[PDB]
């Protein structure tokens, strides 16, 4: 069912802010959202430069990537998702930002690694095991996959922690500045690696990095550290999931609480930014919803407010904002700091000019769950088209080529 | 009568363009329009703040500011005109370019010199002659002016030409940058300065500066060169209007035709694009309009279709553009050469918001002429209020204030 909305133009949603060293002109984002239209090989194809392109035509919006692996340890799905790794994926990924710049629009890309969750056989082809904090699994079928094909998963060694910073988050941000992004993005959400560093359930270790509150922040505080030294702060952002299970993360139901684990972290930014190394934001997801589920009332444990009290910047907060629409009382109390974007997702799959939408009232097109992470156009490109014009069988048999 | 107009949503005006190292995103343009709510002291006020702030909304629009003096030789209006010459200009401006700035748009100084057309009682008070190539007037009435008051205009000596390139003009473009202009825009047109040294009906100097076609244009050409390496040549703009007969140019009547004088400057123009020191775009008026007055179709000597033809950079064009509204036929082959930007200056006095009424189409509020020019907020800022809440009385009394 399309979704009523009432226009947000006379709202906050449609004041700049200034974002790191970019000035934003509307406060709706469209967070990183994974849709698997890469190229094989991961490097970003002819679909993803258009799909990009047709987001950002409301000048001043503030796209993010889908998650975007730093590396090839860092991969691990069967579908085609894309990596900023080599010259190659820069490259292409160049021609992406150029388009969304060229509309007076900014970038950033989600860098992601799986971890525990990478798939063995998937793995097993680049020689590699699925790494970890620790030696764990996502559920028993996780762990039945895994030594199926003798691929169990491994808790990382402590060089190999370090050579995460030094190497592969290095790397891939060096790759992110060559290929024009505004802002790289650290995905410690959702289960994936960082988050199995940050809580106890997923990190058991007992070198520098588990083992304590502090000890299990300190990659990712490391992260934030060097990364900031090379790319600056200005062009860092972070993304969390205090309340979430998605991949089975305890959250509330762990030994230390997200409430503890997450005001440490969010803390620790502060007081950088206190001494003048501020990242440009934070990215919270909302308790309505957890990884790509959403989660009535009754099941939500907690809430991202002490996001605001303890964190002076920038915030981007997710999950399900058109749940009050039309009217979006939710969205316009929580924007009402002027330093608080929102986003939409979902919706911004069926709606690729969703900012134009919002802002002036327009119904929303209903988004299509069975093409979220199908492997071609249709469902994807094909909401930009008229449906008139939409020859579903070519667009079905259109899978990603390589641009230009 | 308010203005129906179609919109333009779908059309070349709201494709991107790139415009020397900035990109726009609405071709739509304000060109330079004299409203005289400056301070006495010619410093900006608090009135034109809110002013360019009220027409910079549409992200990425070219506003191009009024007339701007660039010493106080340059000046001569009873009315009160900015000025860009002392820190005190320039910081008073940068808090207008900030604004403009922080909604992803971007700002033109237009750079004016009155010339033979100076007040002489004004001039007399800064103890100035009126200046020009040549000892001329536009008018026996303008002549009786200046010899009753024993201020005669003078030709200046080739050493005040020089100090126009390296004191006069350095200096304000010097300070257009300490206050964040993005360019600046030399006014040779309209009669005034640069467009009395470009003709012969103004120009009858023996030294370098005149003598020939060639001759006349050497100042023009002298400051886009100088000025060229100082602020570089993609922050260079220059406005002609071959056909006007504004301030008593022959214009098609002289005895060089406008075509000749405005196609060899526009032509050096080029040969220096030619060589990677292309200015950033070429204003021209339309010869549907002669300075602030329209021009019937029959009183038309010729066209601006040698711009086009010569010069392969951007082009700005205004005048009149509303005449077959609502359907806006002329524009729409104007700019679909994809270089050319379409300015409106009358509609934009009375409508802040005009690239978003253009865009979807919206009615114009009537332009109101008996206020073009005077000296208070009423029929100034006030197009941005709801009628409901205009004070009138008090509008009337609102003379401009310093900044803050
Ligand atoms: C198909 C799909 C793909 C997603 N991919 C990512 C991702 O790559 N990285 C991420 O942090 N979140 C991802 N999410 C979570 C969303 O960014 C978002 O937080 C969530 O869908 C709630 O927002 P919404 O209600 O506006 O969709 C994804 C969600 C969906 C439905
Ligand atoms: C009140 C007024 C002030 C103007 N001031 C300037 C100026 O300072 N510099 C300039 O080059 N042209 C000036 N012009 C000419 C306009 O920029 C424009 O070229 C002309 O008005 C035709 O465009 P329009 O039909 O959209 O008004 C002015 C015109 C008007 C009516
Ligand atoms: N990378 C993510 O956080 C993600 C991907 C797909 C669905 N939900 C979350
Ligand atoms: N400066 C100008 O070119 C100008 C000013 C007022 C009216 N018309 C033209
Ligand atoms: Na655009
Ligand atoms: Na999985
Ligand atoms: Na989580
Ligand atoms: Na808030
Ligand atoms: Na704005
Ligand atoms: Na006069
Ligand atoms: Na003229
Ligand atoms: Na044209």
Same sequence: chains 1, 2.
């Avoid at 970038?107 to 095991?129: C, E, H, W, Y």
């Avoid at 910047?313 to 009402?336: H, W």
Wanted: include cysteine.
């Amino acid at each position: 069912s399309s979704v009523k909305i009432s226009p947000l133009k006379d709202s906050e949603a449609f004041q700049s802010i200034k974002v790191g060293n970019n000035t934003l002109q509307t406060k709706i984002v469209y967070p990183p959202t994974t849709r698997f239209r890469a190229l094989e090989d991961h490097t970003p194809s002819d679909l993803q430069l258009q799909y990009y392109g047709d987001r950002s035509t409301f000048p001043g919006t503030l796209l993010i990537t889908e998650a975007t692996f730093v590396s090839p340890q860092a991969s691990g799905y069967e579908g085609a998702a894309p990596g900023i790794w080599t010259d190659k994926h820069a490259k292409a990924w160049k021609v992406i930002t150029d388009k969304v710049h060229a509309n007076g629009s900014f970038v950033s890309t989600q860098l992601i690694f799986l971890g525990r969750v990478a798939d063995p056989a998937v793995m097993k082809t680049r020689g590699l095991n699925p790494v970890s904090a620790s030696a764990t699994y996502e559920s028993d079928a996780a762990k039945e996959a895994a030594e199926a094909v003798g691929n169990p998963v491994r808790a990382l060694t402590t060089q190999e922690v370090k050579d995460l910073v030094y190497e592969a988050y290095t790397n891939a941000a060096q790759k992110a500045m060559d290929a024009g992004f505004d802002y790289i993005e650290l995905h410690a959400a959702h289960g994936y690696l960082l988050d199995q560093f940050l809580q106890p359930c997923t990190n058991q270790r007992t070198d520098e990095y588990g083992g304590s509150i502090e000890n299990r922040a300190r990659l990712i505080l490391e992260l934030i550290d060097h990364l900031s030294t090379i790319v600056g702060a200005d062009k860092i952002g972070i993304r969390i999931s205090p309340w979430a299970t998605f991949q089975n993360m305890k959250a509330h139901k762990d030994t230390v609480h997200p409430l503890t684990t997450f005001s440490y972290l969010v803390h620790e930014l502060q007081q950088r930014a206190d001494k003048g190394q501020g990242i440009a934001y934070i990215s919270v997801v909302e308790p309505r919803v957890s990884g790509n589920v959403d989660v009535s009332e009754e099941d939500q444990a907690g809430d991202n407010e002490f996001v605001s009290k303890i964190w002076k910047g920038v915030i981007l907060k997710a999950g399900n904002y058109s749940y009050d629409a039309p009217e979006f009382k939710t969205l316009k109390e929580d924007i009402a700091d002027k330093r608080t974007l929102v986003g939409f997702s979902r919706y911004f799959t069926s709606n690729p000019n969703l900012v134009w939408k919002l802002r002036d009232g327009i119904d929303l097109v209903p988004y299509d769950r069975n093409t979220f992470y199908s492997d071609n156009n249709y469902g994807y490109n094909t909401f930009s088209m008229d449906s008139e014009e939409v020859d579903k069988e070519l667009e079905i048999k259109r899978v990603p080529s390589a641009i230009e």
